[model samples]
Target: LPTSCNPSDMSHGYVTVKPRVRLHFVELGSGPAVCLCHGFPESWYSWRYQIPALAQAGYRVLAMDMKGYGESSAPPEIEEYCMEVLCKEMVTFLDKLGLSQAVFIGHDWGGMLVWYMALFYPERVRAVASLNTPFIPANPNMSPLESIKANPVFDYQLYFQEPGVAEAELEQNLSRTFKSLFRASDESVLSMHKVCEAGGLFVNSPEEPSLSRMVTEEEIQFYVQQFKKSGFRGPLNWYRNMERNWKWACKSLGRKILIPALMVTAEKDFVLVPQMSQHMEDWIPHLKRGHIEDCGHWTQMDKPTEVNQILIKWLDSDAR
Candidate 1:
């Protein structure tokens, strides 16, 4: 896929998905391909812990900076960030890399996209795995945002859907924003949920000490620097297209993920709320579920060793 390019050096480079779209990715190793996609407001750096472990275990890894989050091309149109286009990007990325099939892994928003990948382009995905986020089938009865509105728990989505509000609030002080975001298991969760309800405007300064056990000061700085370069507009656009995603799903009605899949749940991830994964079996029949106790939203980062063990074990099996 690299052609004349070096695999080791593909860590920070761009691949053109189309005429004006370039996706950035960090690639490593030289075995069965395993592609990693990060969630909202974060970059490929989120998979920092899992990269080497997966590589050492004999898999070529490609952790990408989703279009708006890192060095990737941040397109200026709202429609461009829709679920259909985002999933197509990964298929194109794999085709360009010369990979007919690759194990696709994702976390948060990345998890959502990979699920869609398997749904829309099953031939390209050998097996799919997601951390924290589960496969939510199409609800012909209600739109995603409408469901969010009906449930008071996701009141935060209302704020993010409004243009320019969260971007301006979060971009004001990147360091504090990251610190507040990447919280530790021992940290207070209630306060943060309150902030989410208030549209992430609770924090007032960047001088706050980070209590994150998963990310160090240096790692937080990496996220801060990237977000500073690429504003929140593109990342927020993902939320903006919620209705469009629901519309697309309704039109193309195949909901089940037939391929062998792994779904990991974080015991302490309040927003995703551990209980949300309970009924996943209704949609994911070939699912192998694992739970990381005492961990929060950032599943792999919060408990890397345990997460890696669960991932590698499932990968080695003939589950597919």
Candidate 2:
């Protein structure tokens, strides 16, 4: 029997699996499945606003904390976080649910997985809506991280990929990290918010206000509580495996996703600009693009109604 979910519950629940990791997920609504992948420094609860909205729209929503965050299983080894293993876990989730296909939605790190899944296994992704991340074409030209470093505001990724630093700092000061990661905007338009324009995803920005500009009081409490469960090491391990991701993806260099792909970029997201999706449509055969005006990287939370409208309309469109 499937697990029961409370109408207003937002906690992530555990599911048993053997050999591989035992996954944890927060589920909402019921119907065709739409797997929502959470990004860096966030658990599945980050999609709390999105879950009920999607569930009400006739889609079974499964928002996961990836492997390292919240209630999900975490492997001690770094190789386990590789694209190969993570992608397989996603397929396993589908099999576990007896789902033939699902609409995959990922944000940030999750978005990258969604892109990789579509490229490597198109059959699994019926349609995709990615917020604040884009299709990374086989760009032999420059490292995406390096391209961002040209701007003084984005130099911290170099520090994040470095060993022992990110995890050490975040683990040592969980509340500080939680506070910074979940800062919410007080204004209707995010440009006025201190962190909206230039809060680098992985970096600790000194310029940002001492207070969180991305998460609300309630959201901050939720993140703080979850961070206490699992320190940041496992989540930061994602950065620790970037080179491994490149090595694994090198085997599928020529692969392209023909499935309908929707990329929603936040214009005010200082970390990743709309230009990131500039040539995405050219690479992916079926790509629909949009921009969340005046928003930052936290697309759904920053603009719930706007994000819901776009996602539901696309989910219901013939493209699916």
C-alpha TM-score for every candidate: 0.91, 0.84
Per-candidate alpha-carbon RMSD to the true structure: 4.1, 5.1
Worst ten in a row by lDDT for model 1: 1-10
**Model 2 local distance difference test score:** 0.72
**30-135 per-residue lDDT for model 2 (tens digits):** 7888999989878787777778788888888888878887778776677777777788888877877678888899998898889888878778888877898878
Poorest lDDT segment (10 consecutive residues) of candidate 2: 187-196
**Model 2 Cα displacement at 118 (Å)?**
0.5
> How well does candidate 1 score on lDDT at residue 215?
65
